[PDB]
Design a protein around this ligand. Structure first.
Ligand SMILES: NC(=O)c1ccc[n+]([C@@H]2O[C@H](COP(=O)([O-])OP(=O)(O)OC[C@H]3O[C@@H](n4cnc5c(N)ncnc54)[C@H](OP(=O)(O)O)[C@@H]3O)[C@@H](O)[C@H]2O)c1
Ligand SMILES: Nc1nc(=O)c2nc(CNc3ccc(C(=O)N[C@@H](CCC(=O)O)C(=O)O)cc3)cnc2[nH]1
Ligand SMILES: [Mn+2]
Ligand SMILES: [Mn+2]
Ligand SMILES: [Mn+2]
Length: 159
């Protein structure tokens, strides 16, 4: 099974200048819980944005060019990325925009955080046909002293 996980600001913005400008510790905690002990697939730009391997996960980087770091696994195509994950129940695709576009047709589940914040950005989550997806979990949180915007965690499953 392939799942995507992402955090979206208003208008589906996911990034600006190869960075995420907000800070939401509760969402990073949700990301860690839902990805730990699973393989994670990311594009090369997102690998550079993160800047170091994510512990407790098999890190698979999609890039057309040779890899430059043996702490992670480098693959050159979508099919190779999937094969490199082996026979696991759930593969987590962690972006960015171009990578989400390629894996969305193959995905059965979306883990989305909707952040109530307006962000100038240059990268967006793909348009996804709402009729194809059923909401199976949602949980709203107001802003607090640690998390400066309200946010909604949602899990969607393909119908
Ligand atoms: N809010 C969120 O949830 C979230 C999550 C992830 C990322 N982001 C943000 O998203 C932005 C990065 O997204 P992005 O669209 O610019 O880049 P991306 O999807 O991270 O990376 C694209 C790169 O991945 C490689 N690639 C992708 N598909 C490939 C394929 N089929 N075969 C071989 N290589 C492939 C290429 O690398 P080469 O040029 O090396 O071939 C391509 O240039 C940043 O702002 C980041 O902070 C946000
Ligand atoms: N829901 C969600 N939120 C995000 O912010 C997010 N970000 C990315 C891409 N960017 C990043 C940047 C940093 C880390 C990271 O360092 N994660 C640590 C969390 C510990 C911490 O710094 O709080 C990890 O161990 O997973 C992960 C993804 C991909 N999917 C996402 N998905
Ligand atoms: Mn091929
Ligand atoms: Mn197999
Ligand atoms: Mn806000």
């Amino acid at each position: 099974m392939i799942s995507l996980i992402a955090a979206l600001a208003v208008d589906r913005v996911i990034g600006m200048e190869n960075a995420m400008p907000w800070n939401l510790p509760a969402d990073l905690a949700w990301f860690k819980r839902n990805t730990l002990n699973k393989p994670v697939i990311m594009g090369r730009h997102t690998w550079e944005s993160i800047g170091r391997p994510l512990p407790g996960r098999k890190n698979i980087i999609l890039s057309s060019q040779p890899g430059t770091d043996d702490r992670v696994t480098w693959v050159k195509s979508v099919d190779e990325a999937i094969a490199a994950c082996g026979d696991v129940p759930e593969i987590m695709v962690i972006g960015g925009g171009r990578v989400y576009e390629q894996f969305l047709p193959k995905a059965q589940k979306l883990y989305l955080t909707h952040i109530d914040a307006e962000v100038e950005g240059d990268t967006h989550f793909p348009d996804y046909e709402p009729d194809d997806w059923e909401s199976v979990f949602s949980e709203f949180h107001d802003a607090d002293a640690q998390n400066s915007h309200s946010y909604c965690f949602e899990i969607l499953e393909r119908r």
